[PDB]
Scaffold this motif. Structure first.
Motif, PDB file in Angstrom:
ATOM      1  N   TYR A  73       0.841  -1.190   0.000  1.00  0.00           N
ATOM      2  CA  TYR A  73       0.000   0.000   0.000  1.00  0.00           C
ATOM      3  C   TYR A  73       0.877   1.242   0.000  1.00  0.00           C
ATOM      4  CZ  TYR A  73      -4.791  -1.710   0.482  1.00  0.00           C
ATOM      5  OH  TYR A  73      -6.025  -2.267   0.238  1.00  0.00           O
ATOM      6  N   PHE A  91      -0.335   9.663   4.124  1.00  0.00           N
ATOM      7  CA  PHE A  91      -1.692   9.311   4.513  1.00  0.00           C
ATOM      8  C   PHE A  91      -1.658   9.053   6.019  1.00  0.00           C
ATOM      9  CE2 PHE A  91      -3.657   9.418   0.504  1.00  0.00           C
ATOM     10  CZ  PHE A  91      -2.832   8.832  -0.454  1.00  0.00           C
ATOM     11  N   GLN A  94      -1.477   5.705   7.817  1.00  0.00           N
ATOM     12  CA  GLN A  94      -0.457   4.861   7.208  1.00  0.00           C
ATOM     13  C   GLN A  94       0.972   4.935   7.746  1.00  0.00           C
ATOM     14  OE1 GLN A  94      -2.702   2.965   5.913  1.00  0.00           O
ATOM     15  NE2 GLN A  94      -2.199   2.975   3.726  1.00  0.00           N
ATOM     16  N   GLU A 119      -6.443   7.138   1.310  1.00  0.00           N
ATOM     17  CA  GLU A 119      -5.524   6.392   0.446  1.00  0.00           C
ATOM     18  C   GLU A 119      -6.199   5.451  -0.554  1.00  0.00           C
ATOM     19  OE1 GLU A 119      -5.736   5.897   3.938  1.00  0.00           O
ATOM     20  OE2 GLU A 119      -7.176   4.364   3.309  1.00  0.00           O
TER      21      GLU A 119
END
Ligand SMILES: Nc1ncnc2[nH]cnc12
Length: 254
Positions: A73, A91, A94, A119
Protein backbone atom coordinates in the motif's frame (compact mmCIF):
# COMPACT_ATOMS: atom_id res chain seq x y z
CA UNK A 1 14.59 1.75 4.38
CA UNK A 2 15.65 -0.16 1.25
CA UNK A 3 15.33 1.79 -2.00
CA UNK A 4 14.96 0.80 -5.64
CA UNK A 5 15.32 3.30 -8.45
CA UNK A 6 13.56 3.48 -11.80
CA UNK A 7 15.64 5.50 -14.30
CA UNK A 8 13.15 7.48 -16.37
CA UNK A 9 15.89 9.58 -18.00
CA UNK A 10 16.87 6.55 -20.08
CA UNK A 11 13.98 4.04 -19.82
CA UNK A 12 13.97 0.50 -21.20
CA UNK A 13 11.42 -2.31 -20.93
CA UNK A 14 14.02 -4.60 -19.34
CA UNK A 15 14.84 -2.02 -16.64
CA UNK A 16 11.15 -1.62 -15.76
CA UNK A 17 10.66 -5.39 -15.48
CA UNK A 18 13.75 -5.85 -13.29
CA UNK A 19 12.51 -2.97 -11.12
CA UNK A 20 9.22 -4.80 -10.52
CA UNK A 21 11.08 -8.04 -9.76
CA UNK A 22 13.19 -6.20 -7.18
CA UNK A 23 9.98 -5.14 -5.42
CA UNK A 24 8.52 -8.68 -5.58
CA UNK A 25 11.72 -10.33 -4.33
CA UNK A 26 12.08 -7.84 -1.48
CA UNK A 27 8.67 -8.49 0.10
CA UNK A 28 8.16 -12.20 -0.68
CA UNK A 29 8.69 -15.18 1.62
CA UNK A 30 10.21 -17.83 -0.65
CA UNK A 31 9.07 -20.60 1.70
CA UNK A 32 5.41 -19.79 0.97
CA UNK A 33 3.69 -21.81 -1.77
CA UNK A 34 -0.01 -21.10 -2.34
CA UNK A 35 -2.23 -23.56 -4.19
CA UNK A 36 0.77 -25.40 -5.58
CA UNK A 37 1.69 -22.42 -7.78
CA UNK A 38 5.08 -20.78 -8.34
CA UNK A 39 3.69 -17.27 -7.75
CA UNK A 40 5.50 -15.09 -5.21
CA UNK A 41 3.67 -14.50 -1.93
CA UNK A 42 4.21 -11.51 0.38
CA UNK A 43 5.69 -12.62 3.70
CA UNK A 44 4.27 -12.03 7.17
CA UNK A 45 4.35 -8.42 8.45
CA UNK A 46 7.65 -7.17 9.89
CA UNK A 47 7.96 -4.91 12.93
CA UNK A 48 11.47 -3.88 11.88
CA UNK A 49 11.48 -3.29 8.10
CA UNK A 50 8.01 -1.83 7.57
CA UNK A 51 8.58 0.35 4.50
CA UNK A 52 10.15 0.33 1.06
CA UNK A 53 11.27 3.41 -0.90
CA UNK A 54 10.84 3.73 -4.67
CA UNK A 55 12.66 6.47 -6.59
CA UNK A 56 11.43 7.79 -9.96
CA UNK A 57 14.60 9.33 -11.39
CA UNK A 58 14.09 11.86 -14.16
CA UNK A 59 16.32 14.35 -16.05
CA UNK A 60 15.15 17.31 -13.95
CA UNK A 61 14.64 15.74 -10.55
CA UNK A 62 13.59 12.73 -8.52
CA UNK A 63 10.20 11.98 -6.97
CA UNK A 64 9.87 9.16 -4.44
CA UNK A 65 7.16 6.81 -3.24
CA UNK A 66 6.85 5.04 0.11
CA UNK A 67 5.16 1.62 0.23
CA UNK A 68 4.20 -0.65 3.11
CA UNK A 69 6.04 -3.97 2.67
CA UNK A 70 3.19 -5.82 4.42
CA UNK A 71 0.73 -5.23 1.57
CA UNK A 72 2.31 -2.86 -1.00
CA UNK A 73 0.00 0.00 0.00
CA UNK A 74 1.30 3.45 -0.91
CA UNK A 75 1.70 5.50 2.27
CA UNK A 76 3.49 8.65 1.09
CA UNK A 77 5.44 10.47 -1.58
CA UNK A 78 8.31 12.96 -1.75
CA UNK A 79 8.70 15.86 -4.18
CA UNK A 80 10.51 19.21 -4.24
CA UNK A 81 8.31 22.28 -4.44
CA UNK A 82 8.79 25.43 -6.53
CA UNK A 83 11.48 26.58 -4.07
CA UNK A 84 13.42 23.30 -4.47
CA UNK A 85 12.44 22.38 -0.91
CA UNK A 86 11.91 18.66 -0.33
CA UNK A 87 8.43 17.93 1.00
CA UNK A 88 6.80 14.69 2.12
CA UNK A 89 3.06 14.03 1.92
CA UNK A 90 1.57 11.10 3.79
CA UNK A 91 -1.69 9.31 4.51
CA UNK A 92 -2.54 9.75 8.22
CA UNK A 93 -3.43 6.17 9.20
CA UNK A 94 -0.46 4.86 7.21
CA UNK A 95 2.74 6.21 8.81
CA UNK A 96 4.16 8.28 11.70
CA UNK A 97 6.54 11.26 11.70
CA UNK A 98 9.46 9.20 13.06
CA UNK A 99 8.95 6.52 10.41
CA UNK A 100 8.57 9.19 7.72
CA UNK A 101 11.85 10.73 8.95
CA UNK A 102 13.57 7.36 8.51
CA UNK A 103 11.96 6.81 5.10
CA UNK A 104 12.63 10.30 3.70
CA UNK A 105 15.61 11.74 5.67
CA UNK A 106 15.96 14.69 3.29
CA UNK A 107 12.66 16.09 4.59
CA UNK A 108 12.53 17.94 7.93
CA UNK A 109 9.61 17.40 10.34
CA UNK A 110 8.16 20.84 9.50
CA UNK A 111 7.92 19.87 5.83
CA UNK A 112 5.94 16.68 6.45
CA UNK A 113 2.32 17.22 5.43
CA UNK A 114 -0.68 15.00 6.09
CA UNK A 115 -2.90 14.53 3.03
CA UNK A 116 -6.52 15.72 3.35
CA UNK A 117 -7.98 12.67 1.60
CA UNK A 118 -7.99 8.88 1.94
CA UNK A 119 -5.52 6.39 0.45
CA UNK A 120 -8.26 4.44 -1.36
CA UNK A 121 -8.77 4.90 -5.12
CA UNK A 122 -12.25 6.40 -4.69
CA UNK A 123 -10.97 9.27 -2.52
CA UNK A 124 -7.96 9.94 -4.73
CA UNK A 125 -10.05 9.77 -7.93
CA UNK A 126 -12.47 12.41 -6.66
CA UNK A 127 -9.59 14.85 -6.10
CA UNK A 128 -8.10 14.08 -9.54
CA UNK A 129 -11.09 15.82 -11.16
CA UNK A 130 -11.36 13.53 -14.19
CA UNK A 131 -14.17 14.92 -16.35
CA UNK A 132 -14.80 12.21 -18.96
CA UNK A 133 -16.33 8.73 -19.01
CA UNK A 134 -16.91 7.18 -15.59
CA UNK A 135 -14.42 9.70 -14.17
CA UNK A 136 -12.28 6.94 -12.63
CA UNK A 137 -8.55 6.18 -12.96
CA UNK A 138 -9.27 4.03 -16.03
CA UNK A 139 -9.92 7.26 -17.94
CA UNK A 140 -6.27 8.39 -17.56
CA UNK A 141 -4.70 5.43 -19.37
CA UNK A 142 -1.35 3.86 -18.44
CA UNK A 143 2.26 3.79 -19.61
CA UNK A 144 5.82 4.97 -19.03
CA UNK A 145 5.37 8.24 -20.96
CA UNK A 146 2.22 8.93 -18.94
CA UNK A 147 4.13 8.37 -15.67
CA UNK A 148 6.80 10.82 -16.85
CA UNK A 149 4.13 13.45 -17.64
CA UNK A 150 2.46 12.98 -14.24
CA UNK A 151 5.80 13.34 -12.43
CA UNK A 152 6.26 16.69 -14.21
CA UNK A 153 3.11 17.85 -12.46
CA UNK A 154 4.61 17.43 -8.99
CA UNK A 155 8.38 17.69 -9.55
CA UNK A 156 9.72 21.11 -8.52
CA UNK A 157 6.32 22.81 -8.55
CA UNK A 158 3.74 24.30 -6.19
CA UNK A 159 1.39 21.64 -4.85
CA UNK A 160 -1.84 21.39 -6.84
CA UNK A 161 -4.20 18.71 -5.50
CA UNK A 162 -5.58 17.77 -8.95
CA UNK A 163 -2.07 17.10 -10.29
CA UNK A 164 -0.97 15.33 -7.12
CA UNK A 165 -3.99 13.00 -7.23
CA UNK A 166 -3.44 12.10 -10.90
CA UNK A 167 0.23 11.42 -10.22
CA UNK A 168 -0.70 9.08 -7.34
CA UNK A 169 -3.25 7.15 -9.43
CA UNK A 170 -0.64 6.45 -12.10
CA UNK A 171 2.30 5.87 -9.71
CA UNK A 172 0.32 3.32 -7.65
CA UNK A 173 -0.82 1.38 -10.71
CA UNK A 174 2.60 1.43 -12.41
CA UNK A 175 4.31 0.07 -9.27
CA UNK A 176 2.15 -1.72 -6.68
CA UNK A 177 -0.50 -2.96 -9.12
CA UNK A 178 2.03 -3.91 -11.81
CA UNK A 179 3.99 -5.86 -9.15
CA UNK A 180 0.81 -7.76 -8.14
CA UNK A 181 -0.49 -8.37 -11.67
CA UNK A 182 1.77 -9.49 -14.53
CA UNK A 183 -1.05 -8.75 -16.97
CA UNK A 184 -0.58 -5.06 -16.12
CA UNK A 185 3.23 -5.32 -16.38
CA UNK A 186 2.93 -7.03 -19.78
CA UNK A 187 0.61 -4.28 -21.07
CA UNK A 188 3.21 -1.64 -20.13
CA UNK A 189 6.14 -3.48 -21.74
CA UNK A 190 4.11 -4.45 -24.82
CA UNK A 191 3.37 -0.76 -25.41
CA UNK A 192 6.74 0.49 -24.11
CA UNK A 193 7.21 3.38 -23.57
CA UNK A 194 3.97 4.83 -24.90
CA UNK A 195 0.83 5.93 -23.13
CA UNK A 196 -2.07 3.60 -23.93
CA UNK A 197 -5.69 2.95 -22.94
CA UNK A 198 -6.48 1.04 -19.76
CA UNK A 199 -9.12 -1.74 -19.78
CA UNK A 200 -11.96 -3.04 -17.62
CA UNK A 201 -9.81 -6.15 -17.09
CA UNK A 202 -7.11 -3.97 -15.49
CA UNK A 203 -9.61 -2.53 -12.99
CA UNK A 204 -11.18 -5.97 -12.43
CA UNK A 205 -7.79 -7.43 -11.45
CA UNK A 206 -7.11 -4.55 -9.05
CA UNK A 207 -10.38 -4.80 -7.13
CA UNK A 208 -10.05 -8.59 -6.84
CA UNK A 209 -6.52 -8.99 -5.43
CA UNK A 210 -7.72 -10.37 -2.09
CA UNK A 211 -10.33 -12.63 -3.70
CA UNK A 212 -7.81 -14.03 -6.17
CA UNK A 213 -5.27 -14.55 -3.37
CA UNK A 214 -7.86 -16.30 -1.15
CA UNK A 215 -8.94 -18.53 -4.05
CA UNK A 216 -5.38 -19.70 -4.78
CA UNK A 217 -4.63 -19.99 -1.05
CA UNK A 218 -7.58 -22.17 -0.05
CA UNK A 219 -9.41 -23.54 -3.10
CA UNK A 220 -6.64 -24.44 -5.53
CA UNK A 221 -4.68 -27.66 -5.97
CA UNK A 222 -1.52 -27.85 -8.09
CA UNK A 223 -2.56 -24.69 -9.91
CA UNK A 224 -6.10 -25.90 -10.61
CA UNK A 225 -9.07 -24.29 -8.84
CA UNK A 226 -11.56 -26.67 -7.21
CA UNK A 227 -14.38 -24.79 -8.95
CA UNK A 228 -14.73 -22.23 -11.74
CA UNK A 229 -14.04 -18.64 -10.75
CA UNK A 230 -14.97 -15.38 -12.44
CA UNK A 231 -13.42 -12.11 -11.30
CA UNK A 232 -15.24 -10.06 -13.91
CA UNK A 233 -13.44 -10.98 -17.13
CA UNK A 234 -14.61 -14.57 -17.61
CA UNK A 235 -14.37 -18.06 -16.14
CA UNK A 236 -10.97 -19.23 -14.92
CA UNK A 237 -10.08 -22.82 -13.97
CA UNK A 238 -6.28 -22.61 -13.83
CA UNK A 239 -4.35 -20.10 -11.73
CA UNK A 240 -1.80 -19.69 -14.54
CA UNK A 241 -4.43 -17.91 -16.63
CA UNK A 242 -4.46 -15.11 -14.05
CA UNK A 243 -0.76 -14.26 -14.67
CA UNK A 244 -0.28 -13.27 -11.03
CA UNK A 245 2.86 -11.49 -9.92
CA UNK A 246 2.37 -11.30 -6.16
CA UNK A 247 -0.16 -12.82 -3.76
CA UNK A 248 -1.50 -11.29 -0.55
CA UNK A 249 -0.25 -12.77 2.73
CA UNK A 250 -2.97 -14.96 4.25
CA UNK A 251 -0.77 -17.12 6.48
CA UNK A 252 1.00 -20.43 5.91
CA UNK A 253 -0.79 -23.04 3.76
CA UNK A 254 -2.67 -25.80 5.61
N1 LIG B 1 -2.81 3.06 -1.67
C1 LIG B 1 -2.83 1.90 -2.33
N2 LIG B 1 -1.65 1.32 -2.66
C2 LIG B 1 -1.67 0.16 -3.32
N3 LIG B 1 -2.71 -0.56 -3.75
C3 LIG B 1 -3.86 0.05 -3.41
N4 LIG B 1 -5.14 -0.39 -3.68
C4 LIG B 1 -5.98 0.56 -3.14
N5 LIG B 1 -5.35 1.55 -2.56
C5 LIG B 1 -4.01 1.24 -2.72
Amino acid sequence: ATAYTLNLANPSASQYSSFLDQIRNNVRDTSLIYGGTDVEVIGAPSTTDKFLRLNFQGPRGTVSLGLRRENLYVVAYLAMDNANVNRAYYFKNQITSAELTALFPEVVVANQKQLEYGEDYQAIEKNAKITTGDQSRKELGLGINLLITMIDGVNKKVRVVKDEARFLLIAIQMTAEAARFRYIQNLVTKNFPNKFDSENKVIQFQVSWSKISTAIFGDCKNGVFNKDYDFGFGKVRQAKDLQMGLLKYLGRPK
